[PDB]
């Protein structure tokens, strides 16, 4: 007998249309990617 899954748990995770983890991981990288968070101005 070989292992057999109708839906591997990766698919079951993926069938979710959105993902709080991924959305938060992308929407807080916003400052680093699209701005400078260190350069202070006076």
């Amino acid at each position: 007998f070989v292992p057999l899954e109708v839906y591997t748990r990766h698919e079951i995770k993926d069938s979710g249309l959105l993902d709080y983890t991924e959305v938060q991981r992308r929407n807080q990288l916003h400052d680093l990617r699209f701005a400078d968070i260190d350069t202070v101005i006076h």
């Binding site: 070989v2 591997t8 202070v40």
Partner: protein
């Protein structure tokens, strides 16, 4: 294959800054904007003030939108607020704040008036990271873009950080008086808060494998060029290649040896105290579906990552079918041999 994240404890220090602008009518008052922000607590403020004297500085200096900005708790002078316990709630961790009444400007005429409010806050938060442990998360939902194991010591500076060098600081011999033994603390100041957690070496702290089951007796047999490991304690038959699986190939697999040796020692003591003896060092094999088997043979006195299938029913089915096949084949062989002997016997 371990899938639960690596979990630990951390502490967030930050100041809720809350500027509110109010309009004052001839019989009423009306908010016309409430700017809110989470300023970080600088380093020496964590060391000299929060951890030492259990007080916070009632003023916030921080760089926001590439500018240096200063907030005073009531637009008044700088003082030191007595950090105190917060209200209680179900299933929430210990928190601490220095104020609980958002200051708002006194009533005047039609003039808008501005009111600041700085609330120093210290919380204990669970933190979680996932392989390859490049960045970790807090239960508040905020992120920190650096590996939990980054550090100056032991070449840890190899690990991933995304922030500049100054924002991170490691303190040796830290003593942590609660706000109601020496430790090494990582302190980071992201543009929203300051996170702190106890630095530990990476390799002994994580593992890409989890002890899933302990089997007192699992029988190993050779068949068709592969090993069958069968257990009646769980009714399961794994199949593995004849050659072993060197642990050096397993990524981050440093807990496997310790856990396996501990479990075999404890089980040997509990059950096989005198009736059996160990034979050689523990061995490691890899089974179909990704299960890694650590096997210690007994005797009577007389790099990569491994993916594990989420269904074990193949193995239990294999065990059931193997048991039935073996027994039926045995009984039918006996019947055939008896029939043969009966015919050879009745020839007379």
């Amino acid at each position: 294959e371990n899938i639960a994240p690596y979990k630990f404890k951390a502490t967030m220090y930050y100041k809720d800054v809350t500027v509110s602008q109010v309009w004052f009518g001839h019989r009423y008052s009306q908010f016309m904007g409430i700017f809110e922000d989470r300023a970080p607590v600088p380093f020496e403020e964590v060391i000299d003030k929060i951890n030492a004297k259990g007080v916070c500085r009632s003023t916030a200096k921080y760089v926001r939108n590439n500018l240096e900005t200063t907030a005073f708790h009531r637009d008044d002078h700088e003082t030191d607020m007595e950090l105190k316990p917060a209200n209680a709630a179900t299933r929430t961790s210990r928190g601490w704040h220095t104020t609980d009444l958002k200051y708002n400007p006194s009533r005047v005429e039609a003039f808008h008036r501005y009111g600041t409010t700085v609330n120093c806050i210290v919380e204990e938060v669970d933190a979680r990271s996932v392989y390859p442990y490049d960045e970790f998360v807090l239960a508040t939902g905020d992120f920190v873009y650096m590996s939990p194991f980054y550090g100056y010591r032991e070449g840890s500076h190899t690990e991933h950080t995304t922030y500049a060098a100054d924002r991170f600081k490691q303190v040796d011999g830290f003593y942590a008086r609660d706000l109601t033994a020496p430790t090494t603390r990582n302190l980071l100041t992201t543009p929203k808060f300051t996170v702190a957690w106890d630095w530990v070496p990476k390799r002994p702290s994580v593992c890409t494998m989890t002890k899933w089951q302990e089997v007192d007796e699992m029988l190993r047999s050779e068949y068709g060029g592969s090993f069958r490991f069968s257990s009646d304690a769980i009714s399961t038959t794994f199949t593995t290649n004849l050659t072993e699986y060197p642990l050096s190939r397993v990524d981050l697999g440093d807990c496997i040896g310790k856990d396996a040796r501990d479990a075999m020692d404890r089980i040997f003591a509990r059950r096989y105290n005198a009736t059996h003896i160990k034979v050689g060092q523990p061995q490691y094999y890899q089974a179909n579906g990704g299960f890694l088997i650590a096997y210690q043979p007994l005797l009577s006195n007389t790099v990569e990552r491994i993916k594990t299938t989420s269904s074990i029913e193949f193995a239990r089915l294999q065990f059931t079918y193997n048991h039935i096949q073996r027994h039926v084949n045995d009984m039918l062989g006996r019947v055939a041999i008896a029939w043969c002997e009966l015919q050879n016997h009745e020839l007379t």
